[PDB]
Design a protein around this ligand. Structure first.
Ligand SMILES: Nc1ncnc2c1ncn2[C@@H]1O[C@H](COP(=O)(O)OP(=O)(O)OP(=O)(O)O)[C@@H](O)[C@H]1O
Lengths: 408, 427, 408
């Protein structure tokens, strides 16, 4: 869905809606400066901080930071809460996160399936200008291209070694059909993260891992075999270490012991771009008795580079909800989207996005091809936003204000 | 898996046996009085939409939150969500306080409850052919089986002929063959040709009971936890057996043996696993480490429907350095679910409920007694007034009556007082 | 001492003083309804809660609940504080309590000593209409029948397998002397609790257990042998599982982890009748940050069935102290008991009961067969009640009010 950063190459002035990104020009222009600061070597071992109101495309801006660095640089999302797990030490939880960010570039010989598609757990048939063949769909392969939104007639390249499907284009509404036989083994660059090499070489996770058993805690013995092989590949010239970008969300939740590890991992010359994201104005530090602005220690605030996102305008919100409406395959009347964006004004964007999927089912029961205002007004009255739900409980708990207008 | 029987905590759902499901018409609008429900139209219709979202597979990493006071139809609506999803679906009602265990971890108890919310629908129809072997060579094989009470000869298909040649056979061997792509052989095994000289042999198998041709019908509806609790024993007494503090019978390695056999039954197409509903009351009581387990749980496709309920407005996040949030749910998990508000019932609505519960429990009562008990449903909680039905029926039976009057219900309040009134009386 | 519940069979209207119970009609009538609620199956897996002022026969009402269920149903008292032990996990402390409540009924062949007694560490002689014999008293046997208050001339039945002495009656002030020889082996029903089977089959506790060593922590291996044998006896028809009654006192002291176990043990179909007892009006929950009425979690209060005891009237208190006076073998003047009950009005019943034993020794030093008012007035002035002792310390610590009448 997200194409890139959506900024000008020379002037670095961002477009209102470009490269899968909508609005937030101030933050995206500041994001473009940070990328240039690292490239010139001006900023060395410095974290980024995307502060702002909730649901202001904070993940998307950092997703833009990734694609604008290199062709295949690793980007990983980590919520600060996910670190505090019942089984897996918060050290291993953070080590996995950093290893998910650092990748290695190796040129490998692997077969790539290239050709036009003729669509139907299932069976999807492929075609070339010379040969035709039927292929039974794998359970994980179905979930892989549905996220890519692959339709019949599309020209695609499926690398069998990685499993990634890449949309090269289309023959009819354009790129023409490939000549030879589908599977062709070529010298292609493979970028696999350190954590992925660990999970490949370590014991395969059995079906229903959350049902019972230990988490993805990679053994120190296995990780050693990978680290020593990567170090041997660096010297040989076989592998090229590429530092990606780690995105940390809910940063206020991080303990003082986490920040000491983050700086220890940031100390390395091949450290990734650590992007922090705080949705809070004023928050206390965890582990430390003292309070701070975004929940960062007195030492981190001076090192970090802060960027601020702003609240979306009704016109900025207009397309965001329509893009999400098309992605969820729903058809709305112009009045309904205007109402849905009006919800996004006082209540959150995320709450308004939830009302999209709920209104579709009520419209399905009415048997209509257009989701209208009365269909949206229902979802708002059936399902409450956090601020309204708490208001509902508070009044039911104790009647704070009487009929007379007297308090208590 | 046939021997595995389902043990369910019926005491939790005992107060809701009067509810048959969710009362709503074809368009989706809730009825005034249907499926054992009175009022709560707004909340009834709301979760009456979430049941369709599950059926349409549009609940991608989503849950439900029931916001409202005590006795506002919260636990009741959760049971309705299961009842409307399908037939013989798992409903696991928990309270945040249950997670707070002494021996097991906060999620070793939350794990088994998730296993108690994911079931298995079995529909296996097998054609049994048990007995000895009396080989005949036709143009593709004729074998005569001998059972304890019957004898039958059958002309086998050429498909079985290839399978029998792989696993060595001779005349006088007890066999278990299946028409539904099944091959099993017991080489030389027969109790008929067993001498009393050898005891440690065990190479022989007894003659199978009944007839050779048997039609085995297997229709099983059990949760994942039922498979774990039945395979833990080295089983009728187990329904009342739990007297051990450690509870070391369920180990991670035992669950792996269940996960592999369940996967094998899915691959064969014999039985598919059906996710149900996990209900968590006192949602604010849950630790921050529990919510991160739930975040990982909701991302899985095998996961059941996680329905939470919180009676609190603004509550501190458990497991965090005093952070006030809505209903005590952290932001990370608050956005993950949709909130359904449950409205309190007015006195006129309360007496309509009383008449439904009394009819189910089997308590005959006068119209004036329903009014007096409804007055306690508005002054005190809905649970307290509903509890007065059983003692007042005993007080009436003692007085020789079947119909419960005001005088009988007046003594019930005098004998059995609510938690609020019992505290203030002591001064 | 306690004979039963002291209630009418048909009307369920309790008598003022019957079956070893005095007063508390409201609570005893409510107790009788609860028993009938379980019998009809109306109440399934529901705890009882005896709330009220201290020393209002809360143990006695629950003792009445037991005897009114079955002939030999197990009843055990447990104070919430006793659970938190220095050696023995509070899980084992609670498991022992629940196993002390569940019993098994097995018909066994055992010799029972039946005959008249001719009384004297000691030596008590027995007699029948056919034979006479002398028997040397065992140290534990002396303590067993002194609690039963066995006097010379009483007709008793001593089951040698259990060791319990049962008063069948008397020959002279009536039941006549037994015919044959004393020891007769008959098929009698034996009801021994699960915990007692554990303590019988496990290693015998050596003399002076509190002097040093681990507590009565029964090994998981021993408990397994009993559980498997009981399960084998249930199927055979040899044993009949009988769920008794567990009495939990000082309930406000229980942790959130205890209530989760209580509900887990209450979940069973063969669970005992769990009776809770709170002497507090408003008390905070332990383990939980929130407050509640009797110290029970927000989930327990709705499941539990609450019964309330009331403060005894001077006429109700009149016989209680006289019953305890006879039990402690003391003789009081009518004026002294009137004074002792007057103490029981403002100060507790338990404090007034303590003044009985103390006044006897002061009366013994005066060499009188009647304990009078001046004998009781002494104990009150020598020994102080909790409310008076704290008052005494507070004034000695800091003179809160001066001679002028000025505070601070
Ligand atoms: N709308 C209703 N129609 C019929 N019975 C109802 C209705 N709402 C609540 N009840 C009944 O009230 C009784 C006690 O309330 P219950 O314990 O279920 O409270 P709840 O709101 O469902 O959940 P919580 O325990 O979280 O308050 C139950 O028998 C329940 O079925």
């Amino acid at each position: 869905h997200i194409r890139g950063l959506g900024v000008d190459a020379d002037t670095l002035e961002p477009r209102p809606s470009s490269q899968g990104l909508v609005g937030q020009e101030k933050a995206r222009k500041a994001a473009a400066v940070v990328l240039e600061m690292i490239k010139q070597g001006k900023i060395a071992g410095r974290a980024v901080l995307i502060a702002g109101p909730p649901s202001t495309g904070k993940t998307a801006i950092a997703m833009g930071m990734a694609q604008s660095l290199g062709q295949d640089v690793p980007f990983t999302t980590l919520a600060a809460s996910e670190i505090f797990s019942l089984e897996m030490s918060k050290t291993e939880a953070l080590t996995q996160a950093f290893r998910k960010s650092i990748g290695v570039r190796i040129k490998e010989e692997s077969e790539i399936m290239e050709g036009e598609v003729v669509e139907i757990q299932g069976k999807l048939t492929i075609k070339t200008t010379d040969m035709e063949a039927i292929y039974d769909m794998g359970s994980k392969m179905i979930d892989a291209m549905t996220k890519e939104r692959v339709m019949a007639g599309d020209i695609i390249s499926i690398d069998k070694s990685s499993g990634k499907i890449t949309k090269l284009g289309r023959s009819y509404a354009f790129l023409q059909c490939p000549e030879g036989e589908l599977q062709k083994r070529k010298e292609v660059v493979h970028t696999v993260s350190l954590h992925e090499i660990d999970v490949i070489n370590s014991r395969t996770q059995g079906f229903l891992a959350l049902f019972s058993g230990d988490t993805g805690e990679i053994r120190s013995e296995i990780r050693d075999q990978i680290n020593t092989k990567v170090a041997e590949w660096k010297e040989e010239g076989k592998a090229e270490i590429v530092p990606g970008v780690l995105f940390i969300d809910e940063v206020h939740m991080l303990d003082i012991e986490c920040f000491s590890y983050i700086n220890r991992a940031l100390e390395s010359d091949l450290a990734p771009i650590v992007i922090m994201a705080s949705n809070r104005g004023v928050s206390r530090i965890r582990g430390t008795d003292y309070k701070s602005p975004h929940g960062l220690p007195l030492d981190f605030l001076d090192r970090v580079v802060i960027i601020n996102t702003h609240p979306y305008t009704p016109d900025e919100l207009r397309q965001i909800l329509s893009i999400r409406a098309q992605e969820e395959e729903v058809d709305l009347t112009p009045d309904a989207l205007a109402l849905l964006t009006k919800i996004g004004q006082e209540a959150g964007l995320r709450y308004a996005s939830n009302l999209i999927t709920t209104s579709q089912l009520i419209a399905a029961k009415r048997r209509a091809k257009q989701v209208g205002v009365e269909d949206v007004q229902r979802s708002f009255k059936l399902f409450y936003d956090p601020a309204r739900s708490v208001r509902f409980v508070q009044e039911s708990e104790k009647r704070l204000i009487g009929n007379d207008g007297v308090v208590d | 898996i046939s021997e595995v029987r389902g043990n369910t905590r019926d005491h939790r759902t005992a107060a809701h046996t009067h509810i048959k499901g969710l009362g709503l018409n074809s368009s989706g609008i809730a009825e005034k009085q249907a499926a054992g429900f009175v009022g709560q139209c707004a909340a009834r219709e709301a979760c009456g939409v979430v049941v369709d979202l599950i059926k349409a597979h549009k609940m991608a990493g989503r849950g439900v939150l029931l916001a409202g006071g005590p006795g506002t139809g919260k636990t009741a609506l959760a049971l309705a969500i299961s009842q409307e999803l399908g037939t013989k679906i798992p409903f696991c009602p928990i309270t945040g306080s249950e997670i707070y265990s002494t021996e097991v971890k906060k999620t070793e108890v939350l794990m088994e409850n998730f296993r108690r919310a994911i079931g298995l629908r079995v529909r296996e129809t097998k054609d049994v052919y048990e007995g000895e072997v009396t080989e005949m060579t036709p143009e593709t094989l004729l074998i005569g089986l001998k059972s304890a009470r019957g004898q039958k000869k059958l002309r086998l298909d050429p498909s079985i002929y290839e399978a029998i040649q792989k696993e060595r056979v001779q005349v006088g061997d007890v066999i278990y063959i299946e028409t539904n792509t099944g091959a099993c052989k017991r080489v030389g095994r027969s109790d008929a040709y067993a001498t009393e000289f050898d005891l440690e042999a065990e190479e022989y198998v007894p003659i199978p009971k009944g007839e050779v041709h048997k039609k085995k019908e297997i229709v099983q509806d059990v949760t994942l936890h039922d498979l774990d609790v039945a395979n833990a024993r080295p089983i009728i007494s187990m329904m009342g057996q739990l007297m051990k503090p450690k509870m070391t019978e369920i180990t991670d390695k035992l669950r792996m043996e269940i996960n592999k056999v369940v996967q094998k039954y899915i691959n064969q197409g014999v039985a598919e696993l059906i996710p149900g509903v996990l209900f968590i009351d006192e949602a604010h009581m849950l630790d921050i480490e529990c919510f991160t387990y739930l975040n990982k749980a909701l991302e899985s496709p095998i996961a059941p429907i996680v329905v939470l309920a919180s009676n609190r407005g603004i509550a501190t996040i458990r497991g965090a350095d005093d952070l006030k949030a809505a209903h005590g749910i952290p932001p990370d998990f608050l956005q993950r679910l949709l909130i359904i508000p449950t409205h309190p019932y007015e006195p006129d609505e309360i007496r309509r409920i009383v008449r439904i519960r009394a009819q189910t429990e089997g308590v005959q009562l006068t119209d004036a007694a329903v009014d007096r008990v409804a007055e306690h449903g508005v002054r005190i909680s809905l649970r307290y007034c509903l509890q007065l039905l059983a003692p007042a029926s005993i007080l009436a039976r003692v007085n020789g009556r079947t119909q419960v009057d005001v005088q009988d219900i007046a003594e019930a309040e005098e004998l059995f007082l609510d938690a609020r009134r019992s505290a203030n009386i002591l001064t």
